[PDB]
């Protein structure tokens, strides 16, 4: 009866950065966010109804599970929702590329102003077997060189000019023509797929029609537990653009709230063209790149004041008892530390050579070894399972003095559990740390896997 099924994880080979056309934005989202400019919090017991926090989107609190999965906040990802912008508006991230394309393509036939030779000269360049980012961004200069010299096409013969970038997020083409994002959408619809690679947009990633926004993905609720406030400010304005069309108003205000929606869509991305946006979550020493992807906070790590101890070997740090009872190393049970871990699990998390967590052999939750019988857990301890024994002497911790200026500021050390709350090391190894004992503190990480224990000790 059973049919075969594979259960195997994989690894990243490459990342192909692309866009989603606004028909792909809709069928990668589970709910419409056409609902209220209010926060979906109701008057009584503030629940969530259709809003901008539908809960099929994500989860902001531990008690409320999301609806499109059954899972709670812990092990559920985000799910996507989408809002429909009434009037299409410029994406401020791709906005320099829209002027970069409207300078290349004709403003009447939507072909690139080139000969059939220069096109074939550049398309011969693009089918090179070796292609770099340098060999791409070099061409987009050169193709915008030869196209911003011409004034008559070869494919329609109509007359083009310059694209001058008037003001904030507006376009002027030479009482001169103004290209609002309403006219840009169908001009980018009429670029041929012949001329899509010549603007260097790899069309497997995304065609130029989706540089501007007519739908918009709202981020899931699990990655926003103040950017929600910028989303409801859109759907407020997405009704003001919906009401005033069927209400009757002069175009200098319907072209103003379209301008006000143009900024508000752009303000949700960048906010320095008060509330941070999606740019400011990826920027500076606080954003996700420089501080959450590289410089991320770390478990099993402590920090005290240092004091000298010449009576240690150069390779040993004296670790306090109270710290060594907290920082734990998962030492798996392997026929040589079975009697040693049995001897120390009877001590439990109060005597220092002891333990405070046992996983069973199969992901059973770590059994906090304080409440139960330790001797019943000692005898039932078998091979394979994990014991989180204390930081014992002979374990490999690694220092760091926080202004790390050279390679020697992180160094491994064997760990001997001494009787105090200071990190005490030999004073010969203090000029690598540039550490005097005038109240200086320095951190102590504790590597968990056995592969990262040898990489500390040897290297």
């Amino acid at each position: 009866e059973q049919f075969r099924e594979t259960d195997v994880a994989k690894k990243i080979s490459h990342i192909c950065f692309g866009m989603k056309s606004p028909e792909e934005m809709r069928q990668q989202a589970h709910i419409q966010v056409v609902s209220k400019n209010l926060y979906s919090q109701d008057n009584q017991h503030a629940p969530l109804l259709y809003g901008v926090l539908d809960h099929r989107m994500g989860t902001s609190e531990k008690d409320r599970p999301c609806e499109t999965c059954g899972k709670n906040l812990a092990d559920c990802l985000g799910h996507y929702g989408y809002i429909d912008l009434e009037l299409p508006c410029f994406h401020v991230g791709y906005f320099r590329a829209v002027i970069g394309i409207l300078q290349m393509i004709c403003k009447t036939c939507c072909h690139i102003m080139l000969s059939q030779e220069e096109k074939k000269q550049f398309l011969d360049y693009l089918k090179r077997p070796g292609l770099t980012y340098l060999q791409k961004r070099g061409l987009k200069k050169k193709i915008s060189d030869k196209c911003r010299k011409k004034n008559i096409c070869h494919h329609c013969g109509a007359f083009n000019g310059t694209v001058k970038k008037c003001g904030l997020l507006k376009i002027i083409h030479e009482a001169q023509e103004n290209l609002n994002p309403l006219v840009v959408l169908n001009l980018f619809k009429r670029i041929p797929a012949e001329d899509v690679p010549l603007l260097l947009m790899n069309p497997e990633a995304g065609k130029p029609s989706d540089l501007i926004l007519t739908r918009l993905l709202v981020p899931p609720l699990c990655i926003r537990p103040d950017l929600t406030m910028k989303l409801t400010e859109i759907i407020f304005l997405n009704d003001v653009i919906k009401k005033h069309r069927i209400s009757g108003a002069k175009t200098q205000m319907i072209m103003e709230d379209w301008d006000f929606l143009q900024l508000q869509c752009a303000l949700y991305i960048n906010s320095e063209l008060w509330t941070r946006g999606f740019v400011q979550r990826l920027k500076g020493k606080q954003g996700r790149f420089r501080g959450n992807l590289s410089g991320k906070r770390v478990d099993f790590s402590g920090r005290t004041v240092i004091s000298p101890d010449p009576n240690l070997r150069i390779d040993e740090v004296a670790v306090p008892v109270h710290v060594a009872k907290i920082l734990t190393f998962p030492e798996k049970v392997n026929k040589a530390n079975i009697n040693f871990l049995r001897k120390l699990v009877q001590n439990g998390p109060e005597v220092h050579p002891g333990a405070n967590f046992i996983q069973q052999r199969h992901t059973q939750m770590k059994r906090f070894l304080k409440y139960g019988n330790r001797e019943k857990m000692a005898q039932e301890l078998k091979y394979g399972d994990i014991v989180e024994r204390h930081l014992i002497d002979g374990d490999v911790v690694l220092f760091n003095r926080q202004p790390s200026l050279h390679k020697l500021s992180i160094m491994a050390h064997l760990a001997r559990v001494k009787p105090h709350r200071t990190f005490r090391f030999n004073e010969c190894v203090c000029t690598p740390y540039n550490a005097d004992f005038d109240g200086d503190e320095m951190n102590l990480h504790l590597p968990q896997t056995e592969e990262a224990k040898a990489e500390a000790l040897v290297l």
Binding site: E86, C109, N186, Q252, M255
Partner: protein, 443 residues
Amino acid sequence: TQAEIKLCSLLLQEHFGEIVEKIGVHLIRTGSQPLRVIAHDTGTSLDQVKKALCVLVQHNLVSYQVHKRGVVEYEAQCSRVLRMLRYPRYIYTTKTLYSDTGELIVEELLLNGKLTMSAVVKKVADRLTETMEDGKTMDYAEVSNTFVRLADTHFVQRCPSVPTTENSDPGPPPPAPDDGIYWQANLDRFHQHFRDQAIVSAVANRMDQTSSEIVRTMLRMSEITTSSSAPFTQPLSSNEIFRSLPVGYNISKQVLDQYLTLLADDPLEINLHKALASLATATLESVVQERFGSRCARIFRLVLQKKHIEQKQVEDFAMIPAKEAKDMLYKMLSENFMSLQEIPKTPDHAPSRTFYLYTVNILSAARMLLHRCYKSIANLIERRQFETKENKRLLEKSQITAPERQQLETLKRNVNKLDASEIQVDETIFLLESYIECTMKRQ
């Protein structure tokens, strides 16, 4: 023009096959591409690419030419592939202008692509005799008579001389005596002749019956002396107009001369530039009439009157209320018919400016509706692609319960409602594409 490429994927899928579509549609997507490069990028074996290009050069969809590298880069012309949609209409006007014999001449010329005279007359000697009475055999000499009779009015033109490059192979393209020389159909002559029906129906349904016939006989005697790139017809005198009138008419010369100076002086204006320019706006106006009622169509004609005089008169010049009117403007704006505010000259201010004036631009509203009509036939064929694969169980039962048969007659009502509706939107393409080709220089 991605929706255009959506149709060329659909048009080849129904006619020949799938890999001849795939290698075909990729060549539309990457252009001047050699034989080995096409087989490597589509992931197709080289034996099937040689066959697929062989069928594609036969039906004149892919053209080959080498310049510098000594390696032939094939190239597919996009706008030819959509002319397959007009194929049964190309059959029909050869039945109104020629007999059943010559109607079958342009048929197997459109079907099998490149034909010699020695083959196509031999084929219609099979098809027309098998439908006629045995013993009353259709004589082939009348076919050779009507074969040249098509060519003297230049409905069939010959293939350009073959390059005969080393990479190209002569043996594979012909399908297996005399050699002869090949030709396709002159479908460009049809696009004159389909335009000839377009202007004669434009006058007859507007001016009078006798006004249109003198337009027809003007254009029927100006066929070979012009081309499609002619900005207007060759100039004629009124004395040969009285010579070229049909024998059904009896009108005196001087009364038709009054109608001749009447027909020369109109808002319509034979100015072939103004003719397709006036017929395209009626195609636009028949779409807003189709979609937004006569009230919004009334303000749609108002912007074709005044170029940049708007929103200070459109509430007055149509007398409809300000609430009801301004939703019609913004619906004409949001669907790109009303074009835009190209008059604002106050600097960088949506609130404070010299007041934005609406203005229709005829070509941006043209190229969109052509792109829309390309999108439309994608939704037509894909439905007929949808309803086909389910009902295959009961097509061969005739070759059966009461809901089983009832699904078939609701299918055959549907497909015949779809397939007829592929052609009624097709006449909007040519009426607008000929307007597109008439305003395009250097092509």
